[PDB]
Design a protein around this nucleic acid. Structure first.
Ligand code: SF4
Ligand code: ZN
Lengths: 118, 677
DNA sequence: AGGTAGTCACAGCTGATTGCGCT
DNA sequence: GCGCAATCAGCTGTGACTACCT
């Protein structure tokens, strides 16, 4: 059996465990806010995570492939668990610390590059 | 000679061994020592079978207890006969190099039509009636009545085999199918029955895929033969596809008409137990209800039995007893012949499957037909969606299942398309004294316009003109036959009609003859024959066909036949019929397979399969061109087999028509020179 | 009364960004 | 929306021209 992290009730299988190896039962599955799923590009832009940090740093981060409502023939969206993405970003960049200044100086350098191009 | 692997010595008929063959043998020995499954990929049609058989024999000699039974399932009968004769050559080499015989038995299995001696059943071309006539001639009741010596026409081979062929075994001597037929006719025994009696006391045995993928016969042909056994599916690059055909059935008006015609005869014979007699009568009306319903599509694999149990109020359990009825009730009825009875059997099998197998399947109804869309044609498909169901029984019964073919470029998709645990991830690229192939991707034409076969540009005049110009000025540099493949029959016929309308097809006509492949089997065969005879002399010819056709895999273009193979656009399967999309959804929500990635994989797999048949043998050489800029993209080049990637230099990935022609001329000129061994 | 670190030209490389394509 | 290829930033090699101390 698997012990849920929230209720502690033993269970055999759960949706999150099958797709993300998360020991959380469907009763405690807060998929609306706590277990929100975001697109691959959104995670890369917000958390400055590269492919290697998403696929090669242990543990590997799984994703769910879902159809795109805008266009079915377009690239199917990949959804990652927000908690896992946050944990990976914290393990790579430390914390909510100077990484913010790092992205600030990144956009400052982008402005520097555009003004130099002008 | 005697190849010395780290813990064994293996005899090989050929003194010279290519490094690829040695690496393949090392990898296969590693897999056998690993006691696990795997997937392999080789670029040569010949030379793989001899190496596989030699290593199997060496492993059996070294470890008789570890391996007891070997299976070499192939696609068709020519492969079976060629591997049988290759095994015969290997055994002859072993005998001539050692001097003493060994108790090894090798037999080939096929349908009853292939292995039969009665002259009253050979001439007919009914594959569904040979089994019925064979069962009628000899069965349990025939054996029971043979005690009184009834004067009736019946098969007598079994009546002699059961008293004379079940005592003398065949410890040694590998026998081909014709050899088995000769032995049966000289001993008055049935080849099929002696094959059934001899598989238990045998070393190796080969047959086709349908004897393992179809559960209705695999259990009968292999139940307790060997717990520790080795099976291989050579040339199975489309195995999953045929796996679908293992659990896919279709229903039409002819089937229900035949059923309603024959049920009256069945009832008349009965009145001359009751748990099924009245059960079968009202089964047809439920499925004919959908005939009168004009609806687009209905999908309810779990709820279909619910609708059945609501309309007619039948429990699900008796359906599971339908199959065991076939061997119980029918033998009491003494059916004269299985003709006009097969639809009933397939309906019973369909009912049993939908009662049992409904987790990963889908029921589809299509009110569409070719050239007669909506007149009368509701087609019901119990289409399969997961290839694991057709592959689980062989994986749970065998230890080292190996999947090998000429095109298995993505080794990461097969283990996730079907439940698999590969431990090999091995690819092999053939090498010779010179580069025998010159693959190249031709992008934009002389007008600097892409020649991509996009759906929005299928009717574009510019791409059609570019394709015509490419086929014209290409036909003057490569001699004696060019094989061109189009995306579909509709696109192919539209393009040739457009070429006929312009004054461009006539220019191609004077260089090479134009031959068109159609759906007719006889027409296709005669077109292939005339193409072969035209390529034999200096006239030269062009064979235009489709990538997804029976001619794509039915023939191999040996050297001097089809020096050039042209791909006009990436061949994409049609998204209609609501069959591909169901599989895409199942792979998305079950195996997390990208729809675009799967479509690209299928397209490139078909393209590589139809383009890699121009290289058969070391001395053979050929040219391979792709007439689409989409092939230049990395996501599609990566799907090509490894033995073609290294020969596809980055210099020619988007070159125009003229430079492609120059490259072809240079390659042919430099490959026309003699070489060495 | 006689010699070398910056500076300039023209190429290379790798490390990211960054608009373009879609059966 | 995702994925592949085009683009630039930064650093370096090669060879030559030029402004202040023994
Ligand atoms: S028992 Fe054998 S020989 Fe006789 S009809 Fe059947 S297949 Fe032919
Ligand atoms: Zn819980």
């Amino acid at each position: 059996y698997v012990i849920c992290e929230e209720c502690g009730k033993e269970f055999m299988d759960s949706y999150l465990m099958n797709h993300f190896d998360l020991p959380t039962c469907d009763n405690c599955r807060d998929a609306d806010d706590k277990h929100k799923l975001i697109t691959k590009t959104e995670a890369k832009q917000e958390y400055l995570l590269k492919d290697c940090d998403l696929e090669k740093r242990e543990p590997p981060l799984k994703f769910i492939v879902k159809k795109n409502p805008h266009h079915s023939q377009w690239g199917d969206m990949k959804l990652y668990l927000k908690l896992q993405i946050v944990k990976r970003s914290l393990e790579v960049w430390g914390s909510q610390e100077a990484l913010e200044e790092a992205k600030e100086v990144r956009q400052e350098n982008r402005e520097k590059m555009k003004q130099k191009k002008f | 000679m005697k190849l010395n692997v780290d813990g064994l010595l293996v005899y090989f008929p050929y003194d010279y061994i290519y490094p690829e063959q040695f690496s393949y043998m090392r990898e296969l020995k590693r897999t056998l020592d690993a006691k696990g499954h795997g997937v392999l990929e080789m670029p040569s049609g010949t030379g793989k079978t001899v190496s596989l058989l030699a290593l199997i024999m060496a492993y059996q000699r070294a470890y008789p207890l570890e391996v007891t039974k070997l299976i070499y399932c192939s696609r068709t009968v020519p492969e079976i006969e060629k591997v049988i004769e290759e095994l015969r050559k290997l055994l002859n080499f072993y005998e001539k190099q050692e001097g003493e015989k060994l108790p090894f038995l090798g037999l080939a299995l096929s349908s009853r039509k292939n292995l039969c001696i009665h002259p009253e059943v050979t001439p007919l071309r009914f594959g569904k009636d040979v089994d019925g006539k064979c069962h009628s001639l000899t069965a349990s009741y025939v054996r029971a009545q043979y005690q009184h010596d009834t004067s009736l026409p019946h098969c007598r081979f079994y009546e002699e085999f059961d008293a004379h062929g079940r005592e003398v075994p065949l410890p040694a001597g590998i026998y081909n199918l014709d050899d088995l037929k000769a032995l049966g006719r000289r001993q008055g025994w049935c080849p099929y029955f002696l094959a059934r009696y001899s598989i238990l006391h045998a070393n190796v045995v080969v047959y086709s895929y349908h004897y393992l993928l179809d559960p209705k016969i695999a259990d009968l042909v292999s139940k307790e033969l060997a717990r520790k056994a080795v099976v291989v599916f050579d040339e199975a690059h489309n195995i999953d596809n045929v796996c679908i055909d293992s659990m896919s059935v279709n229903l039409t008006r002819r089937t229900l008409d035949r059923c309603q015609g024959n049920l009256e005869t069945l009832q008349k014979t009965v009145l001359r137990a009751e748990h099924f007699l009245g059960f079968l009568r009202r089964l047809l009306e439920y499925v004919k209800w959908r005939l009168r319903v004009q609806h687009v599509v209905q999908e309810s694999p779990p709820a279909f039995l619910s609708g059945l149990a609501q309309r007619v109020c039948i429990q699900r359990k008796p359906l599971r007893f339908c199959a065991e009825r076939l061997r119980s009730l029918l033998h009491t009825l003494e059916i004269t012949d299985l003709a006009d009875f097969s639809p009933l059997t397939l309906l019973a099998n369909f009912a049993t499957l939908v009662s049992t197998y409904a987790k990963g399947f889908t029921i589809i109804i299509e009110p569409f037909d070719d050239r007669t869309p909506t007149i009368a044609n509701p087609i019901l498909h119990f289409s399969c969606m997961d290839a694991s169901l057709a592959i689980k029984p062989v994986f749970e019964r065998f230890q080292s299942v190996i999947i090998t073919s000429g095109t298995l470029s993505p080794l990461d998709i097969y283990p996730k398309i079907l439940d698999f645990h590969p431990v090999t991830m091995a690819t092999f690229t053939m090498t010779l004294a010179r580069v025998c192939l010159c693959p190249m991707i031709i992008g934009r034409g002389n007008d600097q316009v892409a020649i991509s076969s996009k759906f929005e540009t299928r009717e574009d005049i510019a791409v059609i003109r570019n394709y015509g110009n490419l086929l014209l000025e290409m036909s003057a540099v490569v001699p004696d036959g060019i094989v061109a493949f189009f995306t579909s029959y509709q696109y192919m016929e539209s393009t040739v009609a457009s070429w006929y309308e312009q004054g461009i097809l006539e220019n191609i006509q004077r260089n090479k003859l134009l031959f068109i492949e159609t759906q007719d089997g006889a027409e296709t065969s005669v077109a292939l024959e005339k193409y072969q005879e035209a390529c034999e002399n200096g006239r030269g010819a062009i064979l235009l066909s489709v990538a997804r056709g029976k001619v794509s895999e039915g023939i191999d273009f040996v050297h001097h036949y089809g020096r050039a193979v042209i791909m006009f656009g990436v061949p994409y399967v049609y998204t209609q019929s609501r069959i591909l999309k169901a599989r895409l959804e199942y792979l998305r929500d079950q195996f997390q397979i990208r729809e675009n990635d799967f479509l690209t994989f299928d397209a490139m797999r078909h393209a590589a399969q139809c383009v890699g048949r121009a290289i058969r043998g070391k001395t053979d050489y050929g040219l391979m061109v792709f007439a689409d800029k989409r092939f230049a993209r990395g996501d599609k080049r990566g799907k090509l087999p490894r033995w073609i990637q290294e020969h596809l230099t980055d210099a020619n990935l988007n070159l125009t028509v003229d430079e492609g022609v120059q490259v072809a001329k240079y390659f042919l000129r430099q490959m026309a020179q003699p070489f060495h061994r």
